User: What shape does this take?
Amino acid sequence: DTNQRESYLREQMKAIQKELGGEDGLSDLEALRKKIEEVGMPEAVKTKALKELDRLERMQQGSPEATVARTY
Amino acid sequence: RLELPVIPLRNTVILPHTTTPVDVGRAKSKRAVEEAMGADRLIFLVAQRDPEVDDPAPDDLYTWGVQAVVKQAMRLPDGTLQVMVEARARAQVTDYIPGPYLRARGEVFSEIFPIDEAVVRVLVEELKEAFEKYVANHKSLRLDRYQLEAVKGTSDPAMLADTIAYHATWTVAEKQEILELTDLEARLKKVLGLLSRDLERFELDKRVAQRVKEQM
Assistant: This one.
């Protein structure tokens, strides 16, 4: 019960970080699609921007691969 | 200024023209309430910080004192001094001289009286229908509809408004700042805003519960 109340308690932490939580990885979410075009026209940085474009789209507080794609 | 003994109610400051139930069950308060009815039935009901404190203290009372009169000379035996009271007038506080008894200052007679009956009655009826839908909405915190015996038995909007407002529950300091509003219309808009904000907090709880559901 300690383990599963810990799990659901941090799940409500994620949910309050998502609905009423404006300060999260969703804060920079608009800056991402705002600045995908300011990535450079050489293939080296453009390719990695486009491959993080879809890898980021999941939840930025609980999903593991979405946070590294979010920060990157 | 009227100097009267202090008899406490739990956390509900009596609104003007209110006949409220009384729960005074302290052995140190029966003498004070009997002397209050022995003083030509003139009584102060100063709100208390505690639910039911045994003895008054110089730093343990709420900021509003208020004149009241007692409707009946006998007390219903229920473990407390269940006596039928009435809102006689209003009072104020200047300074404490600690006792016991803590002597309290007073005021002249002050209540609410109706001056208009068209716009006032429309606003009272809007708060009344919002109070009906609020009693239907406060079932999340279980508010009964036995309040409809009093908010519908009365007919005068000046007491209809206070019967609507006293039958619900909110913070005591909001009552200290809403009985500063002698005019009834500001009291109407404050109570209606409280009911609407209760609806909004219900919706906010539902929104965060929906986020918990999709987080699942």
